[PDB]
């Protein structure tokens, strides 16, 4: 009887870029609009039921983080719904801010273009009425040219925001990829904590029980109600049996 902590892998060929790393294949990504792709899922790494040290469980489809058990009754993958959803909840609120924060680009814009709007209307004024007078000729010519210099300049903000957009993605992609690695380890530690010495650490993300742990025992480990004293002894002889 053995329990493993692991995570999700799938047929995704989506690649994002962090800063130190490029073309990193992830299971779940999201495509902003300007070549910007933010990772939502995690590193796509598909592999005796191994744990998470060298493995992303393709056979695990019910979530991001979860366990793969094996006892007398049978074996199978099972996603931790609580963990997976906290990750999804947090990442969602972040991805949204990015969409929401960049929404200052237009709010402020709405003005430069009700104003751009007012000017080339004012320019079409002078083009239609111009059908001393040619002092007003190169006068208008001076302003129309200043309108282009003005738009190029406003567009400089688009150019210089490109790069706002580009770095925010690479950085949030790392905070994210790190965030997963966190939650995964936390789950392993939470299990390692309960089991203590009633189970052997294999070092591959799996724990080898010294006592037979049925499906109910597994659920107890999952929902954090593992009774250590209950099996303490039978693990204890088993450690010394060998």
């Amino acid at each position, epitope marked *: 009887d053995t329990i493993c902590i692991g995570y999700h892998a799938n047929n995704s060929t989506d690649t994002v870029d962090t800063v130190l790393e490029k073309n990193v294949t992830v299971t779940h990504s999201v495509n*902003l609009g300007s070549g910007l792709r933010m990772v939502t899922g995690l590193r796509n790494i598909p592999q005796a039921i191994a744990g998470f040290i060298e493995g992303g469980w393709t056979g695990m*489809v019910d979530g991001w983080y979860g366990y793969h058990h094996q006892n007398e009754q049978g074996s199978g993958y099972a996603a931790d719904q609580k963990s997976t959803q906290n990750a*999804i909840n947090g990442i*969602t609120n972040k991805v949204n801010s990015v969409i929401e924060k960049m929404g200052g680009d237009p709010e402020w814009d709405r003005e430069i273009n009700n104003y751009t709007s007012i000017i080339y209307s004012l320019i079409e004024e002078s083009q239609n009425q111009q059908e001393i007078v040619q002092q007003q000729n190169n006068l208008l010519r001076a302003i129309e040219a200043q309108q282009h210099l003005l738009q190029l300049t406003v567009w400089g903000i688009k150019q210089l925001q490109t790069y706002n957009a580009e770095l925010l993605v690479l950085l949030e992609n790392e905070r994210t990829l790190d965030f997963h690695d966190s939650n995964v380890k936390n789950l392993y530690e939470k299990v390692k904590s309960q089991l203590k010495n009633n189970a052997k650490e294999i070092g591959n993300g799996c724990f080898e029980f010294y006592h037979k742990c049925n499906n109910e025992c597994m659920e107890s480990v999952k929902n954090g109600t593992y009774d250590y004293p209950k099996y303490s002894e039978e693990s204890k002889l088993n450690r010394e049996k060998i």
Partner: antibody
Amino acid sequence: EVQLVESGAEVKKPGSSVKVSCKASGGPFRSYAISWVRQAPGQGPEWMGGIIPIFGTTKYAPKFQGRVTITADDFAGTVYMELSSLRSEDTAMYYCAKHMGYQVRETMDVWGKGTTVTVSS
Amino acid sequence: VLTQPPSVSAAPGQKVTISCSGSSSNIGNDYVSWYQQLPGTAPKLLIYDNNKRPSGIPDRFSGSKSGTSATLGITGLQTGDEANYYCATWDRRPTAYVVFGGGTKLTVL
């Protein structure tokens, strides 16, 4: 709290298809699942299907399993329900409803107002 | 499908219970939700997880689940409570799906 807005009423012929949308406020990305629940007059509600955020997994009621398709546009903060092979008894009020977590379950806390689809010859 | 009483009746201040009979595969091992529907309105969540209340729902409503049956209780009954009441849960047995009760039309006598 989240407000769920659904597309306008639809009139369709038997055998044709209809595609309804639902847009969630805030977001646009969601951290909870969304299901489509229908009500014919004057009957009890029927759960049709749902979609999980990020995973995009869909589960469908077996009664509609086969001719319903639930898709999501996460950037648009919009999900869609497309029901094909329409019959006259597909005439109903259709609600989008969000769940509390990413998992489709009996608990839908917020509901769209419903839009009417009429199927007649 | 879950079996509800077609209708149940009582007066202001008085109390009434709406039952929901299912089987082992649905009610037997899943959580039960309750919804209220006035005419011309979307279903509104009353109870979830057998007996929990969303904010906005007063302690005049309450729920219970026993084995294969579940119960909605409404005390201090008022005029606005006149509506249709549906129970809901998870039916794992077929292919897993959410199932609703036939519905109970409440009449405030």
